[PDB]
């Protein structure tokens, strides 16, 4: 009579027609709230959001009535499998409401936690902007200490009892979905099981993330050693030339990024980095021109122009009206080919660079807009930010800034400026890879049951010393949940995307620059005015989720799996500089030493 492949296709057509309208209303309502913060808009967003959320769960329940194995079309199966993801629905009504109570309790604790200064009693500060300012700008050992310890004593201890129940429920939810644990559930974002020759496994993610981590260690060892040697000048005591790096002394509260250690550890402090902010204001640049020049960047490489609705509807600058807007830079794919960007665009170099980043998201959204509704995403959770990140790589290079007249025609690039630029990139890119790897390795084993609840903080601080070279300033006695102090752990967010995206980022850039016939160091590459590079990237962008990420990655970089040699090639001039600067320094760390040992 009729195959089950036809029934799901008809079901998807009915779903797509109503998903498009209901999601757009949810997206439009969320856009109105984000561009106009009023109490009425919150109710309108929630009612529109709940209606779409209720509709999706109803369709997901109906989607599970179709056998997934009885499908031969790859495109159809990817849509149904995405729709058949039951999630927390498989839990009992008693546990499902308990889980959401736990998740909301942790988010409220994280967003309302306040660490208090021991010296000044009524000096309790929230993480943002209170504790973030202390952990990003202060150079006092004690000031960074109480802020670091206060955030984990006050907030981490309030999340430890919740996280233990969180782990048990999320594992029960995952085991109901026929997953080994909740960590295995998260690794399913990278799993590909139906495209022969490009299949990827959830277990294979661990074996591939570990392989890339063993290759970045020598680069990280010298970066760790050079930072440690420079930090010895700032912190003569409380540090060891052969030991680890104290956790509070890093760039931020958790040590996720070392970007805030650039002033303390800059290679050549007398020669400043390239800053075109002054020239832009002297050339009469406004927010319109920043996005116009950003648009010219994508036109040069062959990507399509911004739509007319983009200019009419986007909030490219903070309104002069009294309406309140939270303007964290975001690119919006509302639906119905409605692409918008909301940003408090100032005339600065950073806003110029993130304009290319956010428009890189929009260019990705425009490319897979022809994909079905359920296949309009990046190839995996790390592809969408990788595409945006490589747009800022080309825009920030002096070669690009000279073409658009932001640098003098006779401007000469210095060798001590490339070192300063590469070092500032290693603080953000390379300084985060051990941190991201360690955190997801910890949660994967905690979910797997390899770390008993009496050893959560015992193995957290023995892996933070062995893999990251980072040692706790103060001991913890299992009544803490230090990982839960991070946003992505308390708020149920997978963290491995920040690792794979970094690998994908420079993998894309290395391949695009070779197509662009770039000669010289990779960090000097600019893919501008190279239609060949832009079209090759556009091939993967148009795929969306129609193809597995292993197939999408191969179409740009020519490699099916993650490769970190492109990342090592990007920092090779710095790595050569680092190894020469570490001739008279000890490279590596010993786990035995701790700041509190003596």
């Amino acid at each position: 009579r009729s195959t089950t492949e036809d029934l799901v296709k008809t079901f998807l057509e009915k779903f797509n027609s109503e998903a498009e309208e209901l999601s757009y209303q949810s997206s439009l309502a969320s856009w109105n709230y984000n561009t106009n913060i009023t109490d009425e808009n919150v109710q309108k967003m929630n009612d529109a959001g709940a209606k779409w959320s209720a509709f999706y769960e109803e369709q997901s329940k109906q989607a599970k009535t179709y056998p997934l194995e009885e499908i031969q079309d790859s495109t159809v199966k990817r849509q149904l499998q995405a729709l058949q993801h039951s999630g927390s629905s498989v839990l009992s009504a008693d546990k499902s409401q308990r889980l959401n109570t736990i998740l909301n309790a942790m988010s409220t604790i994280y967003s309302t936690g306040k660490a208090c200064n021991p010296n000044n009693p009524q000096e309790c500060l929230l993480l943002e902007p209170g504790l973030d300012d202390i952990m990003a700008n202060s150079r006092d050992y004690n000031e960074r200490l109480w802020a670091w310890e206060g955030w984990r004593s006050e907030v981490g201890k309030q999340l430890r009892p919740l996280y233990e129940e969180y782990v048990a429920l999320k594992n029960e939810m995952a085991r109901a979905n026929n997953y080994e644990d909740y960590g295995d559930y998260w690794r399913g974002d990278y799993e590909e099981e139906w495209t022969n020759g490009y299949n990827y496994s959830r277990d294979q993610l661990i074996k591939d993330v570990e392989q890339t981590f063993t290759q970045i260690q020598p680069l990280y060892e010298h970066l760790h050693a050079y930072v440690r040697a420079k930090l010895m000048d700032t912190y003569p005591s409380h540090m060891s030339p052969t030991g680890c790096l104290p956790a509070h002394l890093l760039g931020d509260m958790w040590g996720r990024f070392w970007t805030n250690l650039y002033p303390l550890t800059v290679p050549f402090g007398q020669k400043p980095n390239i800053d075109v902010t002054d020239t832009m204001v002297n050339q009469s640049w406004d927010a319109r021109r920043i996005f116009e020049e950003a648009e010219k960047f994508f036109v040069s490489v062959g990507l399509p122009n911004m739509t007319q609705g983009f200019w009419e509807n986007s909030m490219l600058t903070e309104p002069g009206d009294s309406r309140k807007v939270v303007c964290h830079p975001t690119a919006w794919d509302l639906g119905k080919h409605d692409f918008r960007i909301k940003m408090c665009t100032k005339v600065t170099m950073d806003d110029f660079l993130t304009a290319h980043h956010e428009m890189g998201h929009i260019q990705y959204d425009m490319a897979y807009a022809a994909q079905p509704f359920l296949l309009r995403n990046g190839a995996n959770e790390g592809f969408h930010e990788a595409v945006g990140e490589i747009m800022s790589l080309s825009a920030a290079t002096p070669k690009h800034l000279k073409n658009i007249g932001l640098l003098p025609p006779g401007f000469s690039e210095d060798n001590e400026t490339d070192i300063n630029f590469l070092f500032k990139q290693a603080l953000t890119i390379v300084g985060t890879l051990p941190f991201t790897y360690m955190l997801e390795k910890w949660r994967w084993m905690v979910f797997k049951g390899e770390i008993p609840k009496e050893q959560w903080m015992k193995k957290w601080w023995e892996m933070k010393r062995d893999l990251v070279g980072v040692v706790e300033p103060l001991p913890h006695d299992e009544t803490y949940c230090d990982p839960a102090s991070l946003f992505h752990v308390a708020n149920d967010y997978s963290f491995i995307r920040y690792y794979t995206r970094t690998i994908y980022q420079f993998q894309f850039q290395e391949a695009l620059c070779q197509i662009a016939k770039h000669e010289g160091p990779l960090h000097k590459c600019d893919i501008s005015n190279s239609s060949e590079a832009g079209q090759t990237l556009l091939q993967m962008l148009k795929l969306g989720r129609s193809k597995p990420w292993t197939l999408a990655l191969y179409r740009v970089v020519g490699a099916k799996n993650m490769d970190v040699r492109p990342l090592l090639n990007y920092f090779d001039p710095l790595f050569t500089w680092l190894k020469e600067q570490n001739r008279n320094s000890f490279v590596g760390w010993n786990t035995d030493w701790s700041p509190y040992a003596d």
């Binding site: 009729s2 309208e21 609705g309 119905k336 080919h337 807009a369």
Partner: protein, 195 residues
């Protein structure tokens, strides 16, 4: 003096849905096409079979104007040999099509803030439409072998879906008033020829 009511067709205050498109027989009048091809308001004037030139030497018994509103992305489907929801389920042009397809964005007219759902398109049908065939049937569509008994359940879908038309949608998902001029000739005396 006696001009054809093309204004009443193109400047009609409201167009019909694509599944229930309105057909008008323009005859017993003199048609002025100068304001059509020389006007920049029309984003699409793809004419098939005949061209605007060499037009005064042809006699057609009657003129049929099929007016309906569809999405911008579906304007490409109003053409012979096209495939899609509109081509197969809502409005099918014959392969031997002799006429001009006129489309123009009507975002200002046919789109409202919050959505304009007065335009419906047949999302599901048991078979593809014949050329120029109009189907206004509104019975529950059966996907599987389970009977629906007049109520939509599982594998039971209402065949008509409503266009969501907001002014902020992308140009692809925007209302486009399409007027299809069909010229028919028969053994009639063909009183209306055009000097």
């Amino acid at each position: 003096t006696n001009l054809c009511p093309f204004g009443e067709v193109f400047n009609a205050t409201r167009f019909a849905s694509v599944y229930a498109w309105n057909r008008k027989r323009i005859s017993n009048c003199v048609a002025d096409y100068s304001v059509l091809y020389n006007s920049a308001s029309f984003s699409t004037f793809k004419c098939y079979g005949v061209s605007p030139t060499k037009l005064n030497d042809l006699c057609f018994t009657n003129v049929y104007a099929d007016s309906f509103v569809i999405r911008g992305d579906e304007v490409r489907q109003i053409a012979p040999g096209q495939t899609g929801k509109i081509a197969d389920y809502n409005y099918k042009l014959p392969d031997d099509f002799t006429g001009c397809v006129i489309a123009w964005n009507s975002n200002n007219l046919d789109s409202k803030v919050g959505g304009n759902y007065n335009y419906l398109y047949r999302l599901f049908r048991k078979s593809n439409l014949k050329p120029f065939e109009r189907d206004i049937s509104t019975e529950i569509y059966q996907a599987g072998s389970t009977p629906c008994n007049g109520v939509e359940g599982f594998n039971c879908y209402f065949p008509l879906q409503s266009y969501g038309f907001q002014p902020t949608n992308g140009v692809g998902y925007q209302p486009y008033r399409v007027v299809v001029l069909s010229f028919e000739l028969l053994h009639a005396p063909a009183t209306v020829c055009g000097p």
